[PDB]
Design an enzyme around this catalytic site. Structure first.
Site, PDB file in Angstrom:
ATOM      1  N   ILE B 131      51.223 120.643  -3.123  1.00  0.00           N
ATOM      2  CA  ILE B 131      52.668 120.942  -3.424  1.00  0.00           C
ATOM      3  C   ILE B 131      52.751 121.859  -4.418  1.00  0.00           C
ATOM      4  O   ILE B 131      51.912 122.062  -5.459  1.00  0.00           O
ATOM      5  CB  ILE B 131      53.255 119.445  -3.895  1.00  0.00           C
ATOM      6  CG1 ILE B 131      54.659 119.608  -4.044  1.00  0.00           C
ATOM      7  CG2 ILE B 131      52.536 119.061  -5.326  1.00  0.00           C
ATOM      8  CD1 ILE B 131      55.460 118.402  -4.220  1.00  0.00           C
ATOM      9  N   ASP B 133      55.511 122.548  -7.401  1.00  0.00           N
ATOM     10  CA  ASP B 133      56.820 121.891  -8.257  1.00  0.00           C
ATOM     11  C   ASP B 133      57.057 123.085  -9.161  1.00  0.00           C
ATOM     12  O   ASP B 133      58.207 123.880  -8.872  1.00  0.00           O
ATOM     13  CB  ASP B 133      56.386 120.634  -8.542  1.00  0.00           C
ATOM     14  CG  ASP B 133      57.407 119.887  -9.481  1.00  0.00           C
ATOM     15  OD1 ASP B 133      58.625 120.487  -9.461  1.00  0.00           O
ATOM     16  OD2 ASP B 133      57.187 118.945 -10.042  1.00  0.00           O
ATOM     17  N   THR B 134      56.592 123.057 -10.433  1.00  0.00           N
ATOM     18  CA  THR B 134      57.028 123.925 -11.365  1.00  0.00           C
ATOM     19  C   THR B 134      56.632 125.451 -11.127  1.00  0.00           C
ATOM     20  O   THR B 134      57.230 126.486 -11.724  1.00  0.00           O
ATOM     21  CB  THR B 134      56.589 123.681 -12.765  1.00  0.00           C
ATOM     22  OG1 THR B 134      55.372 123.605 -12.918  1.00  0.00           O
ATOM     23  CG2 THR B 134      57.345 122.191 -13.028  1.00  0.00           C
ATOM     24  N   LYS B 162      58.605 122.167  -3.589  1.00  0.00           N
ATOM     25  CA  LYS B 162      59.888 121.562  -4.102  1.00  0.00           C
ATOM     26  C   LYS B 162      60.390 122.566  -4.991  1.00  0.00           C
ATOM     27  O   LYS B 162      60.382 123.074  -6.224  1.00  0.00           O
ATOM     28  CB  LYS B 162      59.542 120.611  -5.104  1.00  0.00           C
ATOM     29  CG  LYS B 162      59.024 119.231  -4.474  1.00  0.00           C
ATOM     30  CD  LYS B 162      59.130 117.958  -5.674  1.00  0.00           C
ATOM     31  CE  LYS B 162      58.105 118.014  -6.632  1.00  0.00           C
ATOM     32  NZ  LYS B 162      58.219 116.590  -7.618  1.00  0.00           N
TER      33      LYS B 162
HETATM   34  O1  XMP Z   1      52.297 112.877  -6.435  1.00  0.00           O
HETATM   35  C1  XMP Z   1      52.701 113.938  -6.972  1.00  0.00           C
HETATM   36  N1  XMP Z   1      54.178 113.847  -6.738  1.00  0.00           N
HETATM   37  C2  XMP Z   1      55.135 115.182  -6.844  1.00  0.00           C
HETATM   38  O2  XMP Z   1      56.243 115.033  -6.661  1.00  0.00           O
HETATM   39  C3  XMP Z   1      54.581 116.334  -7.663  1.00  0.00           C
HETATM   40  N2  XMP Z   1      54.897 117.134  -8.343  1.00  0.00           N
HETATM   41  C4  XMP Z   1      53.888 118.114  -8.838  1.00  0.00           C
HETATM   42  N3  XMP Z   1      52.889 117.243  -8.466  1.00  0.00           N
HETATM   43  C5  XMP Z   1      51.507 117.593  -9.208  1.00  0.00           C
HETATM   44  O3  XMP Z   1      51.735 118.513 -10.422  1.00  0.00           O
HETATM   45  C6  XMP Z   1      50.843 119.504 -10.220  1.00  0.00           C
HETATM   46  C7  XMP Z   1      51.302 120.794 -10.593  1.00  0.00           C
HETATM   47  O4  XMP Z   1      52.090 121.291  -9.985  1.00  0.00           O
HETATM   48  P1  XMP Z   1      53.308 122.586 -10.736  1.00  0.00           P
HETATM   49  O5  XMP Z   1      52.606 123.171 -11.798  1.00  0.00           O
HETATM   50  O6  XMP Z   1      53.717 123.321  -9.358  1.00  0.00           O
HETATM   51  O7  XMP Z   1      54.238 121.633 -11.281  1.00  0.00           O
HETATM   52  C8  XMP Z   1      50.767 119.436  -8.534  1.00  0.00           C
HETATM   53  O8  XMP Z   1      49.147 120.043  -8.166  1.00  0.00           O
HETATM   54  C9  XMP Z   1      50.599 118.303  -8.212  1.00  0.00           C
HETATM   55  O9  XMP Z   1      49.389 117.823  -8.275  1.00  0.00           O
HETATM   56  C10 XMP Z   1      53.226 116.083  -7.975  1.00  0.00           C
HETATM   57  N4  XMP Z   1      52.184 115.031  -7.755  1.00  0.00           N
END
Ligand code: XMP
Ligand code: XMP
Ligand code: MG
Ligand code: MG
Lengths: 214, 216
Positions: B131, B133-134, B162
Site C-alpha cells: 500500500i 499511504d502518505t 490511498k
Molecule cells: O494495515 C495497514 N492498513 C493501512 O491502511 C495502512 N496504511 C499504511 N500502512 C502502512 O504504512 C506503511 C507506510 O506507508 P506510507 O509511507 O505510504 O504511509 C505501509 O507500508 C503500510 O505497511 C498501512 N497498514
C-alpha cells in the site's frame, strides 16, 4: 480445476497447453498441490485448535491460554523458498479458523526473526523442502535453544525421505517426492522458475544453466 | 479465488463474507474475487509494459549489447516485507501466466533486512508494495534504490493506493485497487500481524486499532 498434463510437438512437458522446456516430468500439478495443502490445513487445525500455551496478551494471567487472535500460533517461514507455500497455507489456515501470525527467517542465519516472545508458545516452522534434513535439524536446534517454545514442529511442502542422512523427521508433510531436483512453486535454480504453479523434475542439463550472480 | 463473494451481515450486526463473520470489520473494501480480478488484469498490464524492454546482460558478462527480458536476464522484483509477501506470491504466478520472466528478492524496511541481489545497475526493477499511504516510505525507498544501484528503470506496483493520505508527492506507476483514507486489514494488511491471512480487505473498526498492544 484439474490440470491437463501432456507433451507438445517437441518432447517438452506441457501443462494446460503451456510448454515447460526445463521440465523432465511433472511431480505435482497446482490442483494436486492445493488439494494436499487444504487437507494439511485441516490436519494442522485439528492438531492445534485445542492446545494451550503462554498468555502474552494478558501478562497478568498466570494460566495457559487457548490459541486465539489474542495468543495465536506462531508460524516461522523460511525465506526465500517458503514464501509462496506460506502465503497459500495461512489462507487455508484461516479457512479452518486457526489463528496464526507469521514471521520470516532467512538462511547460517542471514535475516533473524523479529518476533521476540516465543517462550512457552506453540511454534510451527513452514519450510519448502526437507532433503538431507541438515538445514531443518540445525534450525530446530537453534530455535529450541534460543527461544524455548512450548512445542516446535515442522511443516514441509515436499519431503524427500530417500535423502535423509541426519536425525530429522518433519511432523507434517504435504507431498512426498523422489530424490530428484525439483523446480516450481517456490523451488528454483538460481531463482528461476520459482513462480511456476506446478512442481517439475528439472532436466539435469538445466541445472547449470544460470551460473551468473544475481 | 475468482468466485463471486456475498457480502452480508449476521444476526449480531457483524460483517459477513460468504457466511463467515468478521467482527473486526466495519465494511468491505474488496472481496477475494475483486482482489484477484484486479491482480490478473494488472499482471497483463505489467506484461505489456515490460515484455519488449531490454536491459543490461548479466547472464553473459562478455556481451556488450542490451538483452531482452528472458530467463537469462529476468525482470527484477523487489518485494517489501512483510506486508507484500502474499500479494507478491499471487502476483508472480499471474506474471508467469502472462509469460513475463521475473525473479524476486525481499527487503525489509522500518532497512532491517537488505537485498541479496547485487546486479541491479542498468536493470529493469519493479518494486512490489502492499500500500501507498502518505508516500514517505516508498519515496525514500525509491530514492535509496536509485542512488545505490542506478537501475535502468524503477517503478512501483502497489496492491492498494490511498491517494487521500498523501503527505509527500508520490505516484506509484501501477495500482491494483484504491481504498478510502481508513485503516485497512486483510490480505496482507494487519494489526500487530493479526488478520493478515484473510482473503478480503476490510476497513477496520476504530475500536480494534489498539486491540493487540503486546509485543509478538
Ligand atoms: O494495515 C495497514 N492498513 C493501512 O491502511 C495502512 N496504511 C499504511 N500502512 C502502512 O504504512 C506503511 C507506510 O506507508 P506510507 O509511507 O505510504 O504511509 C505501509 O507500508 C503500510 O505497511 C498501512 N497498514
Ligand atoms: O529447488 C530445489 N529443489 C530440491 O529438490 C531441493 N532440495 C534441497 N533444496 C534446497 O537445499 C536446501 C538444503 O536442504 P536439506 O538441508 O534438507 O538437504 C533446501 O532448504 C532447499 O533450499 C532444494 N531446492
Ligand atoms: Mg480478533
Ligand atoms: Mg510496507
Amino acid at each position: 480445476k484439474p490440470n491437463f498434463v501432456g507433451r507438445d510437438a517437441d518432447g517438452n512437458v506441457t501443462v494446460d497447453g503451456r510448454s515447460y522446456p526445463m521440465a523432465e516430468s511433472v511431480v505435482a500439478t497446482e490442483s494436486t498441490i492445493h488439494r494436499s495443502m487444504k487437507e494439511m490445513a485441516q490436519t494442522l487445525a485439528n492438531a492445534y485448535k485445542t492446545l494451550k500455551h503462554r498468555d502474552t496478551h494478558n501478562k497478568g494471567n498466570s494460566a495457559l491460554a487457548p490459541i486465539t487472535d489474542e495468543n495465536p500460533l506462531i508460524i516461522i517461514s523460511v525465506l526465500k523458498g517458503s514464501y509462496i507455500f506460506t502465503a497459500d497455507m495461512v489462507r487455508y489456515l484461516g479457512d479452518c479458523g486457526l489463528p496464526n501470525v507469521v514471521d520470516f527467517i532467512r538462511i547460517q542465519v542471514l535475516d533473524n526473526l523479529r518476533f521476540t516472545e516465543l517462550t512457552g508458545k506453540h511454534v510451527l516452522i513452514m519450510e519448502d523442502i526437507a532433503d538431507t534434513g541438515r538445514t531443518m535439524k540445525l534450525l530446530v536446534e537453534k530455535i529450541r535453544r534460543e527461544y524455548r517454545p512450548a512445542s516446535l514442529k515442522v511443516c514441509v511442502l515436499v519431503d524427500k525421505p530417500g535423502g535423509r542422512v541426519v536425525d530429522f523427521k518433519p511432523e507434517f508433510v504435504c507431498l512426498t517426492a523422489p530424490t530428484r531436483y525439483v523446480v516450481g512453486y517456490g523451488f528454483e535454480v538460481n531463482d528461476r522458475y520459482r513462480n511456476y504453479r506446478h512442481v517439475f523434475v528439472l532436466k539435469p542439463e538445466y541445472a547449470k544453466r544460470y551460473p551468473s550472480k544475481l
